[PDB]
Write an enzyme that holds these catalytic residues in place. Structure first.
Site, PDB file in Angstrom:
ATOM      1  N   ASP A  42      19.890 -67.500 -36.080  1.00  0.00           N
ATOM      2  CA  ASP A  42      19.516 -66.148 -35.686  1.00  0.00           C
ATOM      3  C   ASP A  42      19.419 -65.304 -36.967  1.00  0.00           C
ATOM      4  OD1 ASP A  42      19.392 -63.464 -34.945  1.00  0.00           O
ATOM      5  OD2 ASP A  42      20.388 -63.850 -33.020  1.00  0.00           O
TER       6      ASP A  42
ATOM      7  N   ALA B 173      13.656 -72.135 -17.864  1.00  0.00           N
ATOM      8  CA  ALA B 173      13.069 -70.811 -17.877  1.00  0.00           C
ATOM      9  C   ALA B 173      13.190 -70.223 -16.483  1.00  0.00           C
ATOM     10  CB  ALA B 173      11.632 -70.883 -18.326  1.00  0.00           C
ATOM     11  N   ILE B 174      14.333 -69.604 -16.243  1.00  0.00           N
ATOM     12  CA  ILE B 174      14.730 -69.203 -14.906  1.00  0.00           C
ATOM     13  C   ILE B 174      14.673 -67.694 -14.896  1.00  0.00           C
ATOM     14  CG2 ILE B 174      16.656 -69.223 -13.245  1.00  0.00           C
ATOM     15  CD1 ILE B 174      15.567 -71.964 -13.482  1.00  0.00           C
TER      16      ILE B 174
ATOM     17  N   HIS C  95      26.836 -74.438 -34.715  1.00  0.00           N
ATOM     18  CA  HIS C  95      26.562 -73.045 -34.347  1.00  0.00           C
ATOM     19  C   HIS C  95      26.434 -72.193 -35.616  1.00  0.00           C
ATOM     20  CE1 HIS C  95      27.349 -69.738 -31.244  1.00  0.00           C
ATOM     21  NE2 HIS C  95      27.207 -69.113 -32.397  1.00  0.00           N
TER      22      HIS C  95
ATOM     23  N   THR D 265      35.773 -70.364 -31.231  1.00  0.00           N
ATOM     24  CA  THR D 265      35.913 -69.825 -29.885  1.00  0.00           C
ATOM     25  C   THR D 265      35.862 -70.905 -28.812  1.00  0.00           C
ATOM     26  OG1 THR D 265      33.549 -69.324 -29.666  1.00  0.00           O
ATOM     27  CG2 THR D 265      34.960 -67.608 -30.585  1.00  0.00           C
TER      28      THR D 265
ATOM     29  N   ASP E 270      17.651 -74.245 -25.594  1.00  0.00           N
ATOM     30  CA  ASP E 270      17.419 -72.917 -25.052  1.00  0.00           C
ATOM     31  C   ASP E 270      15.960 -72.520 -25.187  1.00  0.00           C
ATOM     32  OD1 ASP E 270      20.172 -72.601 -24.557  1.00  0.00           O
ATOM     33  OD2 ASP E 270      20.305 -70.777 -25.727  1.00  0.00           O
ATOM     34  N   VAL E 271      15.509 -71.644 -24.288  1.00  0.00           N
ATOM     35  CA  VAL E 271      14.097 -71.191 -24.283  1.00  0.00           C
ATOM     36  C   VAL E 271      13.818 -69.946 -25.128  1.00  0.00           C
ATOM     37  CG1 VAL E 271      14.183 -69.661 -22.224  1.00  0.00           C
ATOM     38  CG2 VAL E 271      12.088 -70.959 -22.748  1.00  0.00           C
ATOM     39  N   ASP E 272      14.860 -69.148 -25.373  1.00  0.00           N
ATOM     40  CA  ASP E 272      14.726 -67.839 -26.019  1.00  0.00           C
ATOM     41  C   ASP E 272      14.674 -68.019 -27.527  1.00  0.00           C
ATOM     42  OD1 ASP E 272      17.507 -68.679 -25.716  1.00  0.00           O
ATOM     43  OD2 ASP E 272      18.165 -66.711 -26.358  1.00  0.00           O
TER      44      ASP E 272
ATOM     45  N   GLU F 169      28.798 -74.330 -23.053  1.00  0.00           N
ATOM     46  CA  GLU F 169      29.092 -74.582 -24.476  1.00  0.00           C
ATOM     47  C   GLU F 169      30.542 -74.982 -24.697  1.00  0.00           C
ATOM     48  OE1 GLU F 169      27.216 -72.306 -27.783  1.00  0.00           O
ATOM     49  OE2 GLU F 169      29.168 -71.282 -27.768  1.00  0.00           O
TER      50      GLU F 169
HETATM   51  O1  LIG Z   1      18.454 -65.833 -16.514  1.00  0.00           O
HETATM   52  C1  LIG Z   1      18.489 -66.844 -17.233  1.00  0.00           C
HETATM   53  C2  LIG Z   1      19.598 -67.082 -18.028  1.00  0.00           C
HETATM   54  C3  LIG Z   1      19.632 -68.222 -18.809  1.00  0.00           C
HETATM   55  N1  LIG Z   1      18.611 -69.062 -18.825  1.00  0.00           N
HETATM   56  C4  LIG Z   1      18.596 -70.302 -19.611  1.00  0.00           C
HETATM   57  O2  LIG Z   1      19.871 -70.547 -20.166  1.00  0.00           O
HETATM   58  C5  LIG Z   1      19.759 -70.524 -21.568  1.00  0.00           C
HETATM   59  C6  LIG Z   1      21.038 -69.975 -22.186  1.00  0.00           C
HETATM   60  O3  LIG Z   1      21.137 -68.600 -22.021  1.00  0.00           O
HETATM   61  P1  LIG Z   1      20.958 -67.615 -23.247  1.00  0.00           P
HETATM   62  O4  LIG Z   1      19.796 -68.067 -24.071  1.00  0.00           O
HETATM   63  O5  LIG Z   1      20.966 -66.255 -22.668  1.00  0.00           O
HETATM   64  O6  LIG Z   1      22.340 -67.775 -24.038  1.00  0.00           O
HETATM   65  P2  LIG Z   1      22.700 -67.349 -25.545  1.00  0.00           P
HETATM   66  O7  LIG Z   1      21.791 -68.037 -26.468  1.00  0.00           O
HETATM   67  O8  LIG Z   1      22.447 -65.890 -25.601  1.00  0.00           O
HETATM   68  O9  LIG Z   1      24.087 -67.836 -25.691  1.00  0.00           O
HETATM   69  C7  LIG Z   1      18.508 -69.703 -21.833  1.00  0.00           C
HETATM   70  O10 LIG Z   1      17.945 -69.999 -23.104  1.00  0.00           O
HETATM   71  C8  LIG Z   1      17.596 -70.158 -20.734  1.00  0.00           C
HETATM   72  O11 LIG Z   1      17.055 -71.419 -21.084  1.00  0.00           O
HETATM   73  C9  LIG Z   1      17.495 -68.795 -18.023  1.00  0.00           C
HETATM   74  O12 LIG Z   1      16.559 -69.547 -18.010  1.00  0.00           O
HETATM   75  N2  LIG Z   1      17.470 -67.700 -17.269  1.00  0.00           N
HETATM   76 MN   LIG Z   2      19.728 -68.727 -26.173  1.00  0.00          MN
END
Ligand SMILES: O=c1ccn([C@@H]2O[C@H](COP(=O)(O)OP(=O)(O)O)[C@@H](O)[C@H]2O)c(=O)[nH]1
Ligand SMILES: [Mn+2]
Ligand SMILES: CCCCCCCCO[C@@H]1O[C@H](CO)[C@H](O)C[C@H]1O[C@@H]1O[C@@H](C)[C@@H](O)[C@@H](O)[C@@H]1O
Ligand SMILES: CCCCCCCCO[C@@H]1O[C@H](CO)[C@H](O)C[C@H]1O[C@@H]1O[C@@H](C)[C@@H](O)[C@@H](O)[C@@H]1O
Ligand SMILES: O=c1ccn([C@@H]2O[C@H](COP(=O)(O)OP(=O)(O)O)[C@@H](O)[C@H]2O)c(=O)[nH]1
Ligand SMILES: [Mn+2]
Lengths: 297, 297
Positions: free
Chosen positions: A269, A65-66, A176, A188, A154-156, A246
């Protein structure tokens, strides 16, 4: 513990598995290298919980969580408490540049959280990529002594349904959600031979996610060290793989086959992809985000 | 070796596994504890051969040929040479009361045979049962130093098709060809509570064979020691399980779930059961015998 003497299971009453009845006829449930592909209906969680509790299994969960992504922690952790390895020993490791922004989340018994302060990179690509270095660094010390398995996500994201010991194995990746029905030429993968992540159009089993992988601490150490080293080679050669960590994870899992594969139930998603019939559960799902806004100052 | 550092697989060209296409829709291909059930069509043997050759895997095959059953060795061994783990390191261990009756079978490169002299018991039941003691005794010395996996089979059999590294795993049993379609209450488990092999009518996953099991040397040592100890308890209590070593093996595998299950392709009797559509291959098959004549002087 992993690989210790295994005590007998107790008597249990559950439905008999019937040899002439598949659990799922609509999906592939085992890979050609005899790794299970984990879908709802393929496992009896009561049997698995017994097996893993009898080993006093401890699971580590890593999350980064950056910068602005600290905003995602509260929901991530609160929903993890509801759905992730409930009844098992859990150690959360939150990697952040802002320890004071980590929310105070109430944990169930036998669960703990450690905050690990790390540097923030400017580019979201580098923040995503450097998770491999950071996880491998922390395997070498903390994780080997503290947990049996590591789960790296991932955190999101939010948990909506059960994510449990069915996933645990020496090495796993996750299909995926965008590509599970795609033919390999459409994947990809990195396609430039100049990159260490390069995969030709006639190779590849699956397209795995950077956002959900794991395994034993030893195998996660191996994967993360290899992907970090490969990224450093690319950097020295002036190339950045098309999908960053990835792309490298996909190369690694092509050459080192995972011992389980998680279905897209485990990273979905719903806004982008809906809720297909083949998904009986959506277990761990994307939280909507404005990529440009949240990735930059 | 087992569990050593695993080198990368080379580039390979093979058909892509398709997530939305099962390998087999007519049979259960994974147990509820996420162990593969090995059927033709579920594995790519080229991938598996690579994985196991890169570990320089050595497989031990144990077979007992006591009293009149020495007559079965020539066909057993000659067909093993054609079909069993070809290209891998193999060590045959022939347990017999008649070393001079072991036929001189020509072996492929990287394959060896040891003759282990043992005592002959009078009762065929005791000859069958005491395999557990004898295998566990030889695990403790020879097998741990000489092989990575043990495969333990009946001698009154012939190989007709491929039996290879797809079977190898920490612990496996084989679905009995007589009962793979049966409901658990119909299984011929030991049903007397006075026996250590006792299984109630509401328990049981499958009915496994006494004639084909195996795993890592450590897990085979565990299984055989446990079944021998359980048999000794029954003997002290004046009870002999209904199907002898097979009854005890079934109890053990109920309480210690196997990490793969072999389909009945791997032990079939065509004279008794024909060739059902669900069996794409008959890999290892019963040689017709006159039970009364061959089991007694
Ligand atoms: O500014 C940032 C960018 C990325 N992340 C970390 O890197 C992961 C991967 O990035 P993101 O979720 O944006 O990738 P996507 O799922 O959109 O491919 C995030 O879940 C976070 O855990 C973060 O902590 N801060
Ligand atoms: Mn993500
Ligand atoms: C064909 C349509 C596929 C649509 C999904 C694409 O997702 C993106 O895939 C990239 C690899 O090709 C890479 O993994 C990023 C990934 O996008 C992320 O994951 C998605 C499922 C969404 O949540 C998206 O917002 C997120 O950025
Ligand atoms: C219902 C019909 C089932 C018919 C198969 C029975 O096989 C016998 O099963 C016993 C346990 O109930 C035990 O395992 C001995 C087993 O008989 C052996 O295996 C068969 C497949 C035959 O080859 C037979 O000749 C052999 O004695
Ligand atoms: O006199 C005997 C009786 C049994 N066996 C061994 O014990 C195994 C099990 O017995 P059998 O094959 O008769 O059992 P079934 O398959 O008929 O259940 C045989 O394959 C032999 O390996 C033997 O060597 N000599
Ligand atoms: Mn037999």
């Amino acid at each position: 513990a992993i690989g210790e003497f295994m005590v007998s299971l107790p008597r249990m009453v559950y439905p008999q598995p019937k040899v002439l009845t598949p659990c799922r006829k609509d999906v592939l449930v085992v890979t050609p290298w005899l790794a299970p592909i984990v879908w709802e209906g393929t496992f009896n969680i009561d049997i698995l919980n017994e097996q893993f509790r009898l080993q006093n299994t401890t699971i580590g969960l890593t999350v980064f969580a950056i910068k602005k992504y600290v905003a995602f922690l509260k929901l991530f952790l609160e929903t993890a408490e509801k759905h992730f390895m409930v009844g098992h020993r859990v150690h959360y490791y939150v990697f952040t540049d802002q320890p004071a922004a980590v929310p105070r989340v109430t944990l169930g018994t036998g669960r703990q959280l450690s905050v690990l302060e790390v540097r923030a990179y400017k580019r979201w690509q580098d923040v995503s990529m450097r998770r491999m270095e950071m996880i491998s660094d922390f395997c070498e010390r903390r994780f080997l002594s503290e947990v049996d398995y590591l789960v790296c996500v991932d955190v999101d994201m939010e948990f909506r349904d059960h994510v449990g010991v069915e996933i645990l194995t020496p090495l796993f990746g996750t299909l995926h959600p965008g590509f599970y029905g795609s033919s390999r030429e459409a994947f990809t993968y990195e396609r430039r031979p100049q990159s260490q992540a390069y995969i030709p159009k006639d190779e590849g089993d699956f397209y795995y996610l950077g956002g959900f992988f794991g395994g034993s601490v030893q195998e996660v150490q191996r994967l993360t060290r290899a992907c970090h080293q490969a990224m450093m080679v690319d950097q020295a050669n002036g190339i950045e793989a098309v999908w960053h960590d990835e792309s490298h994870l996909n190369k690694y899992l092509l050459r080192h086959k995972p011992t389980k594969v998680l279905s897209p139930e485990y990273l979905w998603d719903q806004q982008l992809l809906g809720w297909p019939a083949v998904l009986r559960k959506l277990r761990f799902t994307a939280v909507p985000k404005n990529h440009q806004a949240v990735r930059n100052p």
